[PDB]
Amino acid sequence: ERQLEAARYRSDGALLLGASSLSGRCWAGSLWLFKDPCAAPNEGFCSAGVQTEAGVADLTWVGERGILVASDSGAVELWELDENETLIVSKFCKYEHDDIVSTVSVLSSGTQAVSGSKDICIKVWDLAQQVVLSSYRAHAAQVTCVAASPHKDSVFLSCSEDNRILLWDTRCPKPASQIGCSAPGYLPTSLAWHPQQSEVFVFGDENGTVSLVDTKSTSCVLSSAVHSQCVTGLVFSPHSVPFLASLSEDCSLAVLDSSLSELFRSQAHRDFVRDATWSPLNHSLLTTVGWDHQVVHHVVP
Amino acid sequence: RVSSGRDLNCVPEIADTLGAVAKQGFDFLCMPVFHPRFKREFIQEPAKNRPGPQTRSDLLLSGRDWNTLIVGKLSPWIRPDSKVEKIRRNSEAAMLQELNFGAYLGLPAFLLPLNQEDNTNLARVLTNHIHTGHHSSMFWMRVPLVAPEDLRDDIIENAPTTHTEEYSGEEKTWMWWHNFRTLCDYSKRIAVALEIGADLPSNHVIDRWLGEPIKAAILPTSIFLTNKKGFPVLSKMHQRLIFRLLKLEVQFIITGTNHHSEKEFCSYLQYLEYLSQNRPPPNAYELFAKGYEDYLQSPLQPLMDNLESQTYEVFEKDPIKYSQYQQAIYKCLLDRVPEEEKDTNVQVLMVLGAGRGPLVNASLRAAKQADRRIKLYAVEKNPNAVVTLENWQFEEWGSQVTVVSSDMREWVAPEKADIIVSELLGSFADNELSPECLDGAQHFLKDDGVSIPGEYTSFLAPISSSKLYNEVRACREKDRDPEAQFEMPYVVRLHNFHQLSAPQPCFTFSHPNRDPMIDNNRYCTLEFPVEVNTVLHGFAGYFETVLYQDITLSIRPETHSPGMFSWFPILFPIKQPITVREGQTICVRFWRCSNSKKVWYEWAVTAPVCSAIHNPTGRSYTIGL
Numbered sequence: 039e040r041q042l043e044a045a046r047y048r049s050d051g052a053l054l055l056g057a058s059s060l061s062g063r064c065w066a067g068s069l070w071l072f073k074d075p076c077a078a079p080n081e082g083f084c085s086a087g088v089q090t091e092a093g094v095a096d097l098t099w100v101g102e103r104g105i106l107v108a109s110d111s112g113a114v115e116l117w118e119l120d121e122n123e124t125l126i127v128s129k130f131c132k133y134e135h136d137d138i139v140s141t142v143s144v145l146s147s148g149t150q151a152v153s154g155s156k157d158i159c160i161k162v163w164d165l166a167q168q169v170v171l172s173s174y175r176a177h178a179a180q181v182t183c184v185a186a187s188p189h190k191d192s193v194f195l196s197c198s199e200d201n202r203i204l205l206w207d208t209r210c211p212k213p214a215s216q217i218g219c220s221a222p223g224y225l226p227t228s229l230a231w232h233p234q235q236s237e238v239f240v241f242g243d244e245n246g247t248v249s250l251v252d253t254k255s256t257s258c259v260l261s262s263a264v265h266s267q268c269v270t271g272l273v274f275s276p277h278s279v280p281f282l283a284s285l286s287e288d289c290s291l292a293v294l295d296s297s298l299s300e301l302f303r304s305q306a307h308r309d310f311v312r313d314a315t316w317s318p319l320n321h322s323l324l325t326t327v328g329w330d331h332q333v334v335h336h337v338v339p
Numbered sequence: 340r341v342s343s344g345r346d347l348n349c350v351p352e353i354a355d356t357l358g359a360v361a362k363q364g365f366d367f368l369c370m371p372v373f374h375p376r377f378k379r380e381f382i383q384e385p386a387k388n389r390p391g392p393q394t395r396s397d398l399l400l401s402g403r404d405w406n407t408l409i410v411g412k413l414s415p416w417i418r419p420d421s422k423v424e425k426i427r428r429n430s431e432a433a434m435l436q437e438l439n440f441g442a443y444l445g446l447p448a449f450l451l452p453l454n455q456e457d458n459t460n461l462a463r464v465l466t467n468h469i470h471t472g473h474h475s476s477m478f479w480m481r482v483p484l485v486a487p488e489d490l491r492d493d494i495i496e497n498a499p500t501t502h503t504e505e506y507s508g509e510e511k512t513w514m515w516w517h518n519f520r521t522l523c524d525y526s527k528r529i530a531v532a533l534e535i536g537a538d539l540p541s542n543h544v545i546d547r548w549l550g551e552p553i554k555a556a557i558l559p560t561s562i563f564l565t566n567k568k569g570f571p572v573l574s575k576m577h578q579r580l581i582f583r584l585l586k587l588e589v590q591f592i593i594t595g596t597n598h599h600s601e602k603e604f605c606s607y608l609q610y611l612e613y614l615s616q617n618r619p620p621p622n623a624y625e626l627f628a629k630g631y632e633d634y635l636q637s638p639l640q641p642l643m644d645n646l647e648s649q650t651y652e653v654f655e656k657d658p659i660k661y662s663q664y665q666q667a668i669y670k671c672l673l674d675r676v677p678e679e680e681k682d683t684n685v686q687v688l689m690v691l692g693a694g695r696g697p698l699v700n701a702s703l704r705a706a707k708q709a710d711r712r713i714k715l716y717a718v719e720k721n722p723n724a725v726v727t728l729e730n731w732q733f734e735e736w737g738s739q740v741t742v743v744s745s746d747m748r749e750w751v752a753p754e755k756a757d758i759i760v761s762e763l764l765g766s767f768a769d770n771e772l773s774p775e776c777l778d779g780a781q782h783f784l785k786d787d788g789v790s791i792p793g794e795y796t797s798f799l800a801p802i803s804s805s806k807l808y809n810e811v812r813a814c815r816e817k818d819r820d821p822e823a824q825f826e827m828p829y830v831v832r833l834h835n836f837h838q839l840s841a842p843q844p845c846f847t848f849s850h851p852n853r854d855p856m857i858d859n860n861r862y863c864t865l866e867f868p869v870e871v872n873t874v875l876h877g878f879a880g881y882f883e884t885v886l887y888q889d890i891t892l893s894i895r896p897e898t899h900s901p902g903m904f905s906w907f908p909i910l911f912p913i914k915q916p917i918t919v920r921e922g923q924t925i926c927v928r929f930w931r932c933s934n935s936k937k938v939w940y941e942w943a944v945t946a947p948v949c950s951a952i953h954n955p956t957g958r959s960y961t962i963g964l
């Protein structure tokens with residue numbers, strides 16, 4: 039599996055890698071754990087690894103042992119880490135979507151989770167009971183990104199190829215709510231919640247423009263042309279006044295200040311930049327992966 | 340049985356996957372030819388220089404398997420109608436790449452979605468790929484019965500779903516097709532795979548897809564209801580729909596995962612097989628005509644031409660029509676020869692177009708059933724048939740029947756006839772020239788004589804069949820007008836089509852026509868109330884005839900003689916199709932024209948728009964006298 043899809047640091051310096059094969063005889067997928075984050079992507083110096091049925095499209099942590107997978111199969115998979123973190127055993131595998139599960143996100147609680155798909159449905163999961171609570175056909179097109187509110191469970195974002203960005207609140211009779219810039223802008227692609235102002239977030243569009251949105255003001259306060267192509271992922275730093283890591287299909291990482299100005303820019307990747315996570319140990323180290331099977335470590339001034 | 344395919348977007352091992360769908364019980368498999376999430380760059384460095392292989396190898400299946408089992412799917416990331424220039428250019432290249440790889444593998448068909456109003460550049464790219472080297476490749480456009488946008492849950496607080504009657508709004512999905520189809524100039528290579536959502540729309544929307552070339556009906560495992568036991572099933576309305584699509588013999592495609600997790604994938608497939616095998620089993624007409632569906636054929640000219648043995652054979656192989664002819668004579672005899680006169684009075688009875696003599700044999704059976712004397716002439720122009728009569732005349736009939744071998748116009752008859760009996764009625768009734776023939780043969784009818792039939796009448800219905808419109812458009816031939824094929828009728832078992840107005844009558848003829856101003860030329864205006872947003876492609880042609888009193892024949896669907904297969908409808912097409920908006924009137928004009936030698940129809944549309952006058956001066960279609 040050459041095409042590395044997700045790259046998520048645990049809250050103890052450990053590294054999770056999600057990979058799919060997007061070419062060759064087998065179109066499969068894997069999950070890997072690296073207790074040495076500098077020893078990736080090398081299969082031989084990995085703490086634990088496993089082969090999924092099929093590819094992974096998105097991947098999140100569910101605490102410290104749990105891994106939540108968005109499989110091409112339409113299944114949402116939960117993989118429980120071993121007692122000694124040597125093995126990665128399937129907890130549950132549940133075929134509830136009717137196309138690729140494109141995105142997953144764990145809710146503030148962490149005993150519930152949302153999952154977007156290519157069947158246009160959003161779903162809310164009970165990771166405890168291992169069933170679907172709610173099933174919402176909000177959108178008119180395949181569900182690009184879903185991102186749980188950091189602090190409130192009922193609340194989360196979804197965006198989609200129908201050009202809608204939906205703010206959800208599972209406490210209302212009409213839970214979804216359409217927000218964003220003045221006119222219909224280009225398609226949203228990625229959604230990062232702000233870590234320390236749950237009022238505001240940022241969305242990346244398909245034309246390489248990261249925008250900043252205040253739900254209160256429900257108006258586009260600021261936006262910048264960062265990339266030439268699509269913005270595939272947006273991760274905030276654990277920093278006091280956090281930086282913003284913007285991924286792209288132009289094979290470049292950029293890190294941005296609060297005012298969306300270009301601080302750092304990396305051409306290290308020579309294929310698409312897929313995911314990125316900051317180190318919880320050193321907050322100025324940032325680990326990006328790509329489809330070039332590279333795991334580059336960035337020292338962020 | 341049903342032709343059934345599995346739609347997947349996840350294929351780990353193509354050997355195994357196709358191994359599984361086969362055992363489940365599917366005939367084919369729709370799968371993405373490249374990985375669906377594996378976007379590719381063609382312009383901007385450094386992503387374009389991505390090391391290959393771009394896809395799994397062709398050697399993974401036999402050429403036979405590629406030619407028989409695999410339907411290719413355009414990768415979902417490809418967006419040729421993007422607003423973003425760069426995404427367009429990239430999607431264009433990716434789209435050809437995936438189409439061209441499809442054609443490399445010699446894949447029966449390739450899938451592409453309509454799921455938006457503007458699919459212009461998508462049509463443009465496909466139209467190019469097509470008009471690039473003639474190849475048996477087929478294209479299934481994936482069109483939803485109901486837009487995703489109009490199916491969504493009413494859960495968006497500030498953009499709600501409008502609960503107001505949207506007649507044209509609910510047809511929007513079909514306009515998507517119509518526009519696409521029209522840009523691709525009605526390619527034979529472009530059909531519809533119709534995707535059926537959980538909530539059906541109004542009948543009138545489902546009525547649009549009549550006369551549209553539906554090679555496939557996509558059914559997501561969602562739309563299936565769960566029963567007492569746990570099996571998948573469908574709503575009674577969903578069933579009616581399946582029964583409508585089974586008559587078009589669509590391939591049924593199963594998309595989405597197994598939501599009946601207590602069964603197999605057999606389950607979904609098996610419900611379909613159970614539906615199909617518990618459908619009203621085929622009636623006398625449907626069974627006989629099962630090959631000839633939407634098969635164009637030039638209308639016979641039994642006057643100018645001589646019919647063949649096996650042509651005459653299928654005329655005779657229709658019992659009902661001759662029972663009716665027998666009855667018709669049976670009655671006329673009684674009404675003409677009083678009970679008391681039965682033995683003193685013989686009737687002079689003349690078949691005019693006697694073929695191999697099924698009307699002669701009917702004329703006999705009728706006489707002894709009604710106990711009256713008859714002398715039979717069997718007038719026949721076709722000398723090959725006359726051989727068959729004279730062989731009957733000699734072996735079985737004897738000198739009762741006098742086989743005459745001339746044109747009934749020409750014949751100088753010895754006596755006059757009580758009853759003349761003609762079967763020389765085509766599919767538009769008067770299109771074989773019964774009126775000209777029986778007018779010439781009238782002078783030897785007794786001053787008080789009966790004709791069987793005495794009255795016949797032609798009926799037109801406007802119809803929509805982009806399908807049959809493509810069939811006719813495909814009848815262009817070298818060394819004649821390139822549109823000549825539109826300016827002539829075709830006898831066809833109209834199947835995949837849509838009747839837009841109830842048939843109204845066109846031309847009526849009487850026999851004996853005793854009028855001193857006998858003129859078989861006609862001008863009839865027809866006004867057709869239309870109550871859909873459809874497209875005009877031509878006019879169905881049917882007929883009814885009175886043989887004698889309450890004995891009639893009809894192919895007019897409403898009054899259609901039960902179990903009668905001597906006749907299929909005729910079809911007058913038109914060059915350019917015509918858009919018809921709901922509650923508009925279609926006005927079509929018809930002329931029966933004639934000189935000394937030819938008889939032809941001309942026909943025009945005067946509303947809602949004007950058409951061009953079809954077949955002026957019989958230049959594209961005449962009927963020899």
Ligand SMILES: Cc1cc(NC(=O)C(=O)N2C[C@@H](C)CC[C@@H]2c2ccc(O)cc2)cnc1N
Pocket residue numbers: 636637638639641653654762763764765766771830904905906907908
């Ligand atoms: C008695 C009678 C009958 C007919 N019948 C027809 O035309 C007709 O509907 N057909 C369709 C099917 C029954 C096959 C024979 C014939 C046919 C064949 C080949 C062709 O190109 C055009 C039609 C016509 N005229 C008379 N007089």
Ligand SMILES: CSC[C@H]1O[C@@H](n2cnc3c(N)ncnc32)[C@H](O)[C@@H]1O
Pocket residue numbers: 641642646654691692693694695718719720721724745746747748762763776
């Ligand atoms: C039974 S279908 C038509 C038959 O009528 C006969 N027929 C058609 N026109 C004429 C005509 N003008 N005179 C005599 N027979 C005719 C044809 O030879 C054919 O057998």
Ligand SMILES: [Cl-]
Pocket residue numbers: 441442445446447448449475476477
């Ligand atoms: Cl093809």
Ligand SMILES: [Cl-]
Pocket residue numbers: 651654655693694695696697698762
């Ligand atoms: Cl006959």
